[PDB]
Ligand binder design. Sequence first.
Ligand SMILES: Nc1ncnc2c1ncn2[C@@H]1O[C@H](COP(=O)(O)OP(=O)(O)OP(=O)(O)O)[C@@H](O)[C@H]1O
Ligand SMILES: Nc1ncnc2c1ncn2[C@@H]1O[C@H](COP(=O)(O)OP(=O)(O)O)[C@@H](O)[C@H]1O
Ligand SMILES: [Mg+2]
Ligand SMILES: [Mg+2]
Lengths: 48, 96, 1058, 96, 88, 571
Amino acid sequence: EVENLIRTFSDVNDTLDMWVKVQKLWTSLEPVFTGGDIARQMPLQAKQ
Amino acid sequence: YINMVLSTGEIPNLLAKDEREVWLGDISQAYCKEKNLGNIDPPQSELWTYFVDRVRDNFHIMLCFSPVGQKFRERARKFPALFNECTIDWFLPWPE
Amino acid sequence: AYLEGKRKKFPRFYFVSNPTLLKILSQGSEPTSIQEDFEKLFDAITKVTFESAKDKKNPALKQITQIQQVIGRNEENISLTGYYVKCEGNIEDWLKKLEQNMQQTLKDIASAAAQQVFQVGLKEFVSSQASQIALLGLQILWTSKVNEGLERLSRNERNAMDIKRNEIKEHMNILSSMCLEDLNGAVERTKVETLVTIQVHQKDISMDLKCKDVNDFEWQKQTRIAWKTDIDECIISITDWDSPYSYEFLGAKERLCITPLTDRCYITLAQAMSMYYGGAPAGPAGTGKTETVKDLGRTLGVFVVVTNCSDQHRYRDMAKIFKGLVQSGLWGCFDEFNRIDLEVLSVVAMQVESITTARKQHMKKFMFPEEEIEIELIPTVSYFITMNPGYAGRQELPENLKVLFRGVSMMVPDREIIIKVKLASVGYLQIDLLAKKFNVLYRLCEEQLSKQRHYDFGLRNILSVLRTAGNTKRQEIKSDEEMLLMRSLRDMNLSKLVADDIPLFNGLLADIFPKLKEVPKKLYPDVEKKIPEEINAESYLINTPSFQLKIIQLYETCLVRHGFMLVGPTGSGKSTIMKILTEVLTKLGSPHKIVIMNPKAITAEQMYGVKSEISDDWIPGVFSTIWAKSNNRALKHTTWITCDGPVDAIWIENLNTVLDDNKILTLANGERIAMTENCKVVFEVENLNNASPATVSRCGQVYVSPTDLGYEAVIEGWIRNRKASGRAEESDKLGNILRKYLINMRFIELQSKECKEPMMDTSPVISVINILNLLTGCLQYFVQTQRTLSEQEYEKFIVYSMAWAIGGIYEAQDRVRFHELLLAKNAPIPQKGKENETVFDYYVSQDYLDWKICSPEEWVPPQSLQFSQLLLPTLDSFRAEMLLNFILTQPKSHTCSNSALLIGGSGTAKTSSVLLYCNKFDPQKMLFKRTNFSSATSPFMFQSTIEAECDFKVGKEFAPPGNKMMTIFIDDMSMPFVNKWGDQITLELVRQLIETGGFYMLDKTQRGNQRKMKNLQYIGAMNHPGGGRNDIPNRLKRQFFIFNMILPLSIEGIYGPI
Amino acid sequence: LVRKTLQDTILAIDGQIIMTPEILEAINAIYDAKVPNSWLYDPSGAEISWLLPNLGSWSTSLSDRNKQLNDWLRSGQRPILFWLTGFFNPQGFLTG
Amino acid sequence: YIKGLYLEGCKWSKNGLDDSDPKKIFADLPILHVSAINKKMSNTYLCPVYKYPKRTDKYLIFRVGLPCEGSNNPSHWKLRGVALLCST
Amino acid sequence: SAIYFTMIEVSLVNWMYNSSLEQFLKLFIESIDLSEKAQLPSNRVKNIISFLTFHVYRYVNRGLFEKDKITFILMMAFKILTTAGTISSGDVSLFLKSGDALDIKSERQKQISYLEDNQWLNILALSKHTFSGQTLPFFKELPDLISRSENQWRNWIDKNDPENFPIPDFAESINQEKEIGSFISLCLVRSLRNDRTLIATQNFISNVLGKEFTDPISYPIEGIWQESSNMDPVLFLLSAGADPTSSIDELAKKKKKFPCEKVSMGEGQERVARQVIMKGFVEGGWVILQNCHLGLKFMEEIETLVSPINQIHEDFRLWITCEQHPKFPLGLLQKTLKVTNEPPKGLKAGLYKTFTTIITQEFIDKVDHSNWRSLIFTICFLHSIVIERKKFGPLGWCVPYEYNYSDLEASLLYIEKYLTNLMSTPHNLPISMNVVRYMICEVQYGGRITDDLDRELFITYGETYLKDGIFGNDYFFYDIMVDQKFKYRIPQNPSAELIKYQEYIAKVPTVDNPEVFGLHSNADLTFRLKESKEMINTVMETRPKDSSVGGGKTREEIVQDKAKDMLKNLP
Ligand SMILES: Nc1ncnc2c1ncn2[C@@H]1O[C@H](COP(=O)(O)OP(=O)(O)OP(=O)(O)O)[C@@H](O)[C@H]1O
Ligand SMILES: Nc1ncnc2c1ncn2[C@@H]1O[C@H](COP(=O)(O)OP(=O)(O)O)[C@@H](O)[C@H]1O
Ligand SMILES: [Mg+2]
Ligand SMILES: [Mg+2]
């Protein structure tokens, strides 16, 4: 049970460590490309 | 607190105001007898002053400090009538 | 990578943070949105006008048609007369277009002014032109006048330079007589002041030039701006280094006074730039290294990007700035660059070394370290490091950096030159003479006078004098310049000075100004007639010249300042000067109220109000609610919010915004209460010791020394008060006797010499106040019976009242010396006694009047006895009972507060002798409450007990149960914690409560309203100071009558009956 | 300041008082004939007494300096030949 | 009439400043008579009187004009490091 | 054991000096093996002791700056004598103090004209000191002997070399004691004629440790590489204005490593250094780390990286170069081979360093006029003379400003700009307006200068060196009687050759007369005194705080007796 819980919490950490990061990245870039003027340019980086 | 207790004889706002009258009720029968057999019902301000003096007479505070500790010297300066008001018996190093 | 791609198109972006760039590029479409961030991109272009343009074809496209620099409410506006900036879609292309058209307009405007300045007056020119081009125009004029002067010396036309110097003086008289016109706005003031900071330096130089040719080095040294018609471009020469003007719109910026050091610093900084080495001026803090580098930039019309360097700066953060400077072609001083971590500077060195090597070879492009591509270098780059040797920050720079930067050691700027400029800036001629005098005085008086805390003879007080010395020059121009300054020096400092230092000052003032025989003061004939008239209302007030003088001096400061404070020792007559002045001003039009509070008595959080930790609701502040009540324009009330307690760094900091010229009180909840004309702030501080030198210079301090209201005046008043009590014959006789021992012979001065080690250190006035109290208390019997006595019967009572008031504080050894001194001066004493017999044993009896040995009342065994709770009548208890009776039976007065502290050794029967006195009180007629103080006891602990013990109320006033006249014994009064500032917080509440008879309620609901207890007496008992035990505040000592309890010589009388 | 420190240094070695940080420094200095930094500079950093390296020479000056002040103060008349060294503020004397 | 100032680098030989005697550092100066002139040059050495031998700008008291008339320039004394020490 | 506890005394002087016990044991073990093998057991022991002392002194002396080189060998000499009964702690204590505790008021009157007031209190201290293994004070009745009308004592103090000549009245009894006699003959010279203490100590060290200790070692870089292994790096302690990186590459050419990796340590240079050192580790090659004191975090990591646990090639040698830094990682100092590269700080050695380095043949051909080469020498000659003034202390410069070569480069770069503008214009001398030249060379150097009276001094040097008559051949700055007399000219070159300037700098004397700086002959007695007071002050800090001094009086009891003797003299 403990070894399975350790394995669980190891995979939880790997997920949650990645989550907070992806959020912060997303939180940084959410205003730029949703915003019109930068997104008017960089058609390739807008589609992504 | 034990300084305050030793000098005053009483802590301010220690016990509830309703709990005074219960305590002072039991105290009264000794008080009337002790004061040259007065045998009149005391007021609750004149009953306290006896109870406080009754506390001090009965309540002893043995302190047990170390003279080498740096706090000991500070506590004497910081708390008056914790050193002055209680008899200091000094423990010398053991003889042969 | 796209951001770095835009950054490279408009370099100045390098100096903005990534969020702000992303905001600007995202809002590139709507150019009104960018308007907030203009002040980060460029220098002194705070706001931009946006016209409608192309309103016929391709509409809703705005066009920029003027550059604004906004200082406070006023602006400097340079309109783009042609070269309009039509603002296209792409922000970084129209922003480049704006920086291009900025310069191209200034070049056009400056070109047409450097032509106009020759064929137009200097008063006429400077008004028409924008700050930056008036400065540039004035500089162009002067360097033409010198050149042309020296050119004519080389051809041998004699007195050709003397003719040009005379013009240069006219040019300077114009600029000083434009400081006298007080033109509106902060822009035109900063425009005319910067012109004057230049033209004193222009005059100073060309007054002692002495060059027989233009090419002679003493002229080449000088900073010279000239408009070359051949290359049609302004060129600024320093030594051999001829830079063109950069044409950055600087607007109206404050210029530092140009010292002979600063001129020699400018040459070094120029020689560095010519050789392509960096510059790095290194001096102590306050020399303005940053400001002198900026001043050179503003002289060349180039933007200087300041970057406040710190530990948090990395090698990447620094590399971004340097990639901005090189690509832009702007200078870039680094304020406090030493404070950068040494790790960083090793990497920055390779960045600066890579920039240097590119500038030396004249490379159009070079590869920066950690950059893949070669970046464009503008030739007119520079980079400066304002360091600090004797560093407060980190160790000296690396070995690589030292090579790259040419230092300038910058001394502290000569004070005389600062003053000289500032006197010119005001509107004085012969600045050189005055500025020498004015310096000499303040430099000398600082050394000669006593080093007291309220004395400031640094630049803070100097600049304060010159604005008040200026306001006086504008109004009376015809008046002599020396006498106006001499007068404005005098009237401000005289108030501050202690009694000992007034003859020293007036001497220095008569040393440095021997031409000026006498200067007339501001008469103030309305108020001067009221003070005598007002004083003779109250029976107890005596009017001395030295007291009337200090009332006037408080009124002089009350008119100009809004934060005037009243310094002086205890019993100096500060509170009474306040009360008199207000009672005078009441009778001359508008009424004047005083609201006494103690800021120390209450916690900082509880005075100003703070956010409650429970229920998240705002509790009103005590001061805020007094301030808000006090600041209303209704029925010309003009209240004075006085702060009796001592000033400390903690509580004045919150109130610091009120004292300053802003005059708005911030509670730090987003509420800012404006100060009305009518309301004023006062401080009845004793010392002013533990207060910052800044907060002192804001307020206008009047000092009241001990000798202004002498104890002789207090005694003379007390006797005046007896005659108004209906008992003139008594007072007449008590006069003859009081004068004989107190003023005729200085007995308190003679006693204090002969008797050593007084157990409590009291002032001579305190001792006299206590005499007059105890002398009352003795004769209070004979008032009731209307019994006048002889001069023998009073002369016994007075020497008793003297003995205990003056010599009570003395221990047994000194009591004998004190009694031996009464035998020398032939006072009435007990003729006969035993060995070690003193005056202190005896007293003067009411029944029959003579000296009687004070034997204690015979003991009556209290039925059943316990040695532990058995207190007997003793000689020491009797004397204590007797003295306590005299102070506590008295009616409250000006001298007495009905309160009697008794000092004495550990276990000397202080606490006992009070408890012996506090029995035999009729429970109906008097009450008694004992509150033992300790190091823990805070003012809220003490305030909560007294508030609970007297709840009965007569209207507004509070009282003890029924109307008993409770006597509040405070055992171990000294114990409460003395803080770093040396001020006992809980005792400043005790003092407030004895003096004013109240404090301010601290229940959330009701704040800024006083609770006033009607009938309270106060006993205290404390172990006498010294040996790491707390002394009571000097201020509080004056309220209490003080006597020393001594261990008995024989305890036979005490323990013999037991 | 000297009087205070010297007395405490005689007490501190005998064990009458605890060794303060200033008194330990003063005892170290006096052994190696250097002036205790307490006497040369105050906590703030301002100069309080003349800067001589050796203790012996510092102590002769204290006697010589004090003598010129005392012989001026006690006697009415001022010295014919002033010892400019002997003043704490010689710049202040000359302005005098 | 100030007394007990010591010339470092130089001696006083009553014909103005003179070269120091071998192995005799800090030669004592005679009684200096200081006054005020009331304001209102070559071959007169404007020597600095220092509080200590350390000589920093803090321990500068004042400057004293020392004649140096015969066969030695004032600039030759500045290089020799001539200065009047109170302390040593 | 003595020597190692000297190395712990040296740790207190400077943080960079501290060496491990584990580094000492290598020297101690090596000193047994390398020593001469004797058949007699006492001769074998004698042979190890001689070899040990030197072999460790050699090792320690290498990682010591020139100011603290003579201080260490004096500590080592006391630490050897303090173990035997020859010197006590009170004896060592005297030499350092020597009656600077005594005050003239309490003690005897001087009585003698020729002694200074300090020289007399120094006498008095000897008169009251019993030394070690003697009944009564050795020097009791010295103040009687010197007070006697004997010119022998006046002559001995007045001598140039007092420490080399025998003591006029006490010589005969000093020769009888061999072990202590050398130390009491030093204490006399510290007392009377203090200035000759550094020279008097050499005489003493040579009679305690042997001649080999007074002689200069001057370690070449080939020796520093031969001493070093792959696992133990070579730390260089850099005094300001020194760079050994060139001297490594010079040795690297002979060892076929010349194109070696170099890495200026800083922020984000850790990732570069790792990549560089991992190549060096396997491939082989030298790795010079510069300004290492700045990048402290890597210096903790490099200790564990260059450990034997990681595979290192035998060829690979690591070279660290860093200026002294407090809170340097101790661990590395205890592994590294510590060397100090300090400038030789003479006038010749100064001039040599500028003409070998920053002046090149390219440089002296930049303007292409006689009057540029003439001026190049005068600015470079002035440069050295302004540096070597700092030796003489507060007489030299009120405040000592380290005048870098940047000040020389700038002042020269200026003269190019100035002369090129006069070269452009049509005895073939340019105008060279020296009024300007003065000011600008007293603006490039004036950058450092904070003091107003130090400024006025430099300004004055300008007026003596950069006068109009330097361009003429028959001008010679200062023609001093140094050795008959050296001329101190501007060397004349028909054709501009760097060799002919370097050739003349050979002929310049090593021992700089004080007359070259415009000072008096007595300036060296003020210099010598300062560097000897500095030696005594550095060895005073190292002294142990042990109460057991010897002679039946503790450290605290000596302080007590003084503190009581002061209190009665207070007013
Ligand atoms: N002009 C006067 N004539 C006579 N008595 C005076 C006069 N002015 C003040 N006094 C009296 O002298 C005492 C001075 O107290 P006052 O409060 O005026 O001074 P203070 O300096 O504010 O005292 P503190 O600050 O210590 O409370 C009081 O007894 C007061 O009534
Ligand atoms: N009149 C008296 N009768 C009996 N005991 C007394 C009397 N006066 C003082 N003492 C005793 O002397 C001591 C004095 O201490 P205390 O009364 O607490 O005063 P203090 O404030 O000086 O400590 C107590 O132990 C008290 O019992
Ligand atoms: Mg008052
Ligand atoms: Mg008590």
